[PDB]
C-alpha cells in the first residue's frame, strides 16, 4: 500500500543518511586531541549565594552587561539580582506561579517568563512610574513553555510542550513563524551567536537545526538514548552540546552532521538538566540530578572538576558573556556564583 | 557612593515585601488535581487558552490551592516534576480504563521526584459501580482473574443497604491500589483510599482531614519520632 511504500522508502533515505555520515567519519575527535596537553585539575569556589527565593528555581539568564541577572522560581516571583553587590534590584510578581523558564533581553529593557500557563509575558523594566509592569502577553501555544530567547527588543523565540517552536513579534501579539517536525516535547533551545539559526532539544532524543527567517529545519541530529533536557551552542556557533536523561552528554557538529564526542562515566547514572559552555568552549559545565555539577573537557572528554555546593538538584546554570563567572540554579531555592 | 546607598535602600524595601509574601506562601496548602480521563475530576471542581486552572477555597481557616492541568498533552513525564513540593496529589479513579489508572498510580508512586509526595486516592463513580455489579452485564473476573479468589477483608465497614456483591467488588479495586502502595515508599509517603461520589459535599472535608495527617507525619519525621 501507499503507507507501507512510504515507510519502505523512508528506510532507504535513512540508510543513505547513515551511509553519508559514515563516510565523513574518517577520524574521531579522540585521536585528534590525543596529543594535546591535559586541561589539568581546575577549582571553583562559591563566591556568592543569592538567597531570597521562596521555592525551587527552574531557570536563570545572565544579562548582556554580565552584572544584572534574572532568576525564575516556582513560588510566583521574578527577581533581578545585582551579582556584584548581592543586592536585589527588582521583584516582579507573576500571575501564574508555575513558570518554568525566563530570559533577559540583550538591551536589558525587558524580561520574559513562561511555564504551565502556556503564555509568555514580557515585563517593561524601564517604565515611567518605576514599578515593573507587564507589556505583552503572548498566547497561542498549546503546551507548557519550556524555553524562551530574545532576538531583539521586538522579537522573541519560544519553545513549548506541543512539539512546536514559534517566533513572536512584540506589539502585535501574533506569532510570525512556526517550527514543526518534532515528535516529543521541546525542553530547551539555544541561539547561535549569528542569530540566523538556532537549535532545540526535544523528548524524541533528536536535535533539529532551524532557520529563523525561513522557518525550515536544516539538519536533524540523532544518537541520544533518552529525552534531551538541555542544549547550548558552541561559542563559535558551528557546534552545540546536548544533555539527556541517559547520563551522557554529546557534542554535535553542524558541518559534520554527526556526533563528535560523548561524555560518560560509570559512576554517573543520573541525567543532565542544564548544559552551558565556557568563554573559549574548552570546558563544558553540565548539571546533574545527584546535586553536583561536573565540568567536562570538551576536547578530551576527561572530567576536570566537580561543583558540590547545592543541597538539591541543579535545574539551571549559565555563564556570563565575558566568562568571568558561572552561576548555577538549584531546587534548594539558592543561587550560587562559582568562580 | 550615593547610588550604592540607594541600591541598599531599594534592596531593603524589597526584603520587606518578600517577608510579607513569605507568610502567605506557607499559609496555603497547594494541591494537585490529577484525575484520570472520564473520571469525574471536572465535577469535583465545579461543585467545590489557559494551560492551568486554579481554585482557592478555605476550610477551617486554612488556605488551600487546588490546580487542575488542562490544555497540556498526555505526556505527563515532564511537567509532573514541577508538582514535587505540593502538600498532596488528588488522584481520581473512575470505578480497560481501570488498568490504565493503576499503571499511572504505580509510576507516580515509584517516581524519583514524587517519592516524598503523598497521594490522596478518590474512588469516584461509586453509584455507577453499584448498578453495574447488580446488573451483571460486565464481569470483573474477565478483566481481573484474581477477583475469583478474593475475599472481603475484616476491616471493611459497609454502609447500610449495601449488598455483599458490590462491597467485595469496590474493596477489590481499592486493594489493587494498596498493593502498589504497600510495595514501595518505605515511610516517605502514604496513600489514603476514599470512596467518593461526584455530588458529595464531604470531599472538601476529606481533603482537609487528609492534609492534617500529612503535615502531622511530616512534623514527626523532623523530630525523628515517627
Amino acid at each position: 500500500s501507499e503507507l507501507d511504500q512510504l515507510r519502505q522508502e523512508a528506510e532507504q533515505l535513512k540508510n543513505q543518511i547513515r551511509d553519508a555520515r559514515k563516510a565523513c567519519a574518517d577520524a574521531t575527535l579522540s585521536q585528534i586531541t590525543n596529543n594535546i596537553d591535559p586541561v589539568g585539575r581546575i577549582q571553583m569556589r562559591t563566591r556568592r549565594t543569592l538567597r531570597g527565593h521562596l521555592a525551587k528555581i527552574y531557570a536563570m539568564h545572565w544579562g548582556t552587561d554580565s552584572r544584572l541577572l534574572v532568576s525564575a522560581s516556582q513560588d510566583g516571583k521574578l527577581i533581578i539580582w545585582d551579582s556584584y553587590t548581592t543586592n536585589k534590584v527588582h521583584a516582579i510578581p507573576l500571575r501564574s506561579s508555575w513558570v518554568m523558564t525566563c530570559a533577559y533581553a540583550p538591551s536589558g529593557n525587558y524580561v520574559a517568563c513562561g511555564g504551565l500557563d502556556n503564555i509568555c509575558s514580557i515585563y517593561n523594566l524601564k517604565t515611567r512610574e518605576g514599578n515593573v509592569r507587564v507589556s505583552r502577553e503572548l498566547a497561542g501555544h498549546t503546551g507548557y513553555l519550556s524555553c524562551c530567547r530574545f532576538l531583539d527588543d521586538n522579537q522573541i523565540v519560544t519553545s513549548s510542550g506541543d512539539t512546536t517552536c514559534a517566533l513572536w513579534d512584540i506589539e502585535t501579539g501574533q506569532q510570525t513563524t512556526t517550527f514543526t517536525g518534532h515528535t516529543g516535547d521541546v525542553m530547551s533551545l539555544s541561539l547561535a551567536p549569528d542569530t540566523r539559526l538556532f537549535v532545540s532539544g526535544a523528548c524524541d532524543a533528536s536535535a533539529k537545526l532551524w532557520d529563523v527567517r525561513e522557518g525550515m529545519c536544516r539538519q536533524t541530529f540523532t544518537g541520544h538514548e533518552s529525552d534531551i533536557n538541555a542544549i547550548c551552542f558552541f561559542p563559535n556557533g558551528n557546534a552545540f552540546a546536548t544533555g539527556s536523561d541517559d547520563a551522557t552528554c554529546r557534542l554535535f557538529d553542524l558541518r559534520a552532521d554527526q556526533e563528535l564526542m560523548t561524555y560518560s562515566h560509570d559512576n554517573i547514572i543520573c541525567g543532565i538538566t542544564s548544559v552551558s559552555f565556557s568563554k573559549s568552549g574548552r570546558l563544558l559545565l553540565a548539571g546533574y540530578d545527584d546535586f553536583n555539577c561536573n565540568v567536562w573537557d570538551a576536547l578530551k572528554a576527561d572530567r576536570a572538576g566537580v561543583l558540590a555546593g547545592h543541597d538539591n538538584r541543579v535545574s539551571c546554570l549559565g555563564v556570563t558573556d565575558d566568562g568571568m563567572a558561572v552561576a548555577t540554579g538549584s531546587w534548594d531555592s539558592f543561587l550560587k556564583i562559582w568562580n | 557612593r550615593n547610588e550604592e546607598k540607594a541600591q541598599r535602600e531599594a534592596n531593603k524595601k524589597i526584603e520587606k515585601q518578600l517577608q510579607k509574601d513569605k507568610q502567605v506562601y506557607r499559609a496555603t496548602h497547594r494541591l494537585l488535581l490529577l484525575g484520570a480521563g472520564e473520571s469525574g475530576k471536572n465535577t469535583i471542581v465545579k461543585q467545590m487558552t489557559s494551560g492551568i486552572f486554579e481554585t482557592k477555597f478555605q476550610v477551617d481557616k486554612v488556605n488551600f490551592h487546588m490546580f487542575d492541568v488542562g490544555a497540556q498533552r498526555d505526556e505527563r513525564r515532564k511537567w509532573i516534576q514541577c508538582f514535587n513540593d505540593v502538600t498532596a496529589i488528588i488522584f481520581v479513579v473512575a470505578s480497560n480504563r481501570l488498568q490504565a489508572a493503576l499503571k499511572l498510580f504505580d509510576s507516580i508512586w515509584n517516581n524519583k521526584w514524587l517519592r516524598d509526595t503523598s497521594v490522596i486516592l478518590f474512588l469516584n463513580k461509586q453509584d455507577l459501580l453499584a448498578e453495574k455489579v447488580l446488573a451483571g452485564k460486565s464481569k470483573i473476573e474477565d478483566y481481573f482473574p484474581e477477583f475469583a479468589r478474593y475475599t472481603t477483608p475484616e476491616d471493611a465497614t459497609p454502609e447500610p443497604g449495601e449488598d455483599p456483591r458490590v462491597t467485595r467488588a469496590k474493596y477489590f479495586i481499592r486493594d489493587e491500589f494498596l498493593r502498589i502502595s504497600t510495595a514501595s515508599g518505605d515511610g516517605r509517603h502514604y496513600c489514603y483510599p476514599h470512596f467518593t461520589c461526584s455530588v458529595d459535599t464531604e470531599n472538601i472535608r476529606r481533603v482537609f482531614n487528609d492534609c492534617r495527617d500529612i503535615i502531622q507525619r511530616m512534623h514527626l519525621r523532623q523530630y525523628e519520632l515517627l
Partner: nanobody
Amino acid sequence: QVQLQESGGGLVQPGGSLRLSCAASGFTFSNYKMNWVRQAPGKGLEWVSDISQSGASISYTGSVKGRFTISRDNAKNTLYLQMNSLKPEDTAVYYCARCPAPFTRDCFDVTSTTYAYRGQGTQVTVSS
C-alpha cells in the same frame, strides 16, 4: 537513533498460537524496561505486559494473565512474547514500548497517542 522493529503475527485460526519478536537497536537493551502495548481498531492503546531489566519482575494484564508469556534476551537485544490459546477478541496491532528513562522504576507515557520510543507494530488477526 532509537529503533524498535517488530515481527511475527498474521492470520491465525482461533485457539492457535503466535510469537512476536521486537528487535532492539540504538540503545543498551540490558538496562531498559520493556512494555507491550496493543491497539485494536476503533479504540485506543492498552497495556499488555512488562518485563524488568533482569526479568525478575514479570506482570501481565488481566486478560492475558494465564495465556501470554513475556521473555527477553539481553545478549541478542530482542524481546519475545509467547502467545498461547488465542481468542478472536485478541486481534490488534502489537507494539513493543521502551521505558522513557534508564534505571527508572516508573515508566510514563507508555500508552500515549504519540510516543517517540515506539516502533511500527505488526497486525495480528485471529479469525476463522
